[PDB]
Design a protein around this nucleic acid. Structure first.
Length: 115
DNA sequence: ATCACATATTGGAG
DNA sequence: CTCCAATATGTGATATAATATA
């Protein structure tokens, strides 16, 4: 009836977890599946974060590749300057024309307003 | 209308 | 007469919103 959603959140744990193990088929990567959430304002409306992340992943799965690559760079934990993290985020998401285009298509298919 | 951190007060033993 | 550990209590920092016009 309804397919499973890949990413889900725990409210009491205040943490959003993406099932990398189910996507890449490796049980060890299960240890990297959880993502930590700290700031309180972002901790509010975390359901919106999870829902829209599920939407983007269901439309296209390239974001899963990108997320696992960024998490790998995080797991390295050697000389990870803020500039290097900025460059990684820029190359994988900011410079990714495909991700921008799929988000733009999702927005443009549901527009019901004429300001 | 919480929440992470600081503090005086109780519990306990040595 | 110190030192330990922990409890309940205090204090700062943050968070709330969805009818547009010099």
């Amino acid at each position: 009836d309804i397919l499973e959603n890949y990413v889900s959140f725990d409210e009491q744990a205040r943490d959003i977890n993406i099932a990398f193990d189910k996507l890449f088929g490796r049980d060890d990567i299960s240890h990297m599946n959880n993502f930590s959430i700290n700031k309180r304002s972002y901790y509010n409306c975390l359901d919106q974060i999870s829902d829209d992340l599920n939407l983007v992943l269901n439309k296209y799965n390239d974001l899963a590749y990108s997320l696992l690559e960024i998490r790998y760079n995080m797991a390295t934990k050697e000389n990870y300057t803020h500039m290097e993290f900025y460059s990684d985020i820029e190359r994988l998401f900011i410079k990714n024309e495909k991700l921008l285009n799929v988000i733009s298509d999702i927005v443009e298919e549901e527009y019901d307003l004429d300001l």
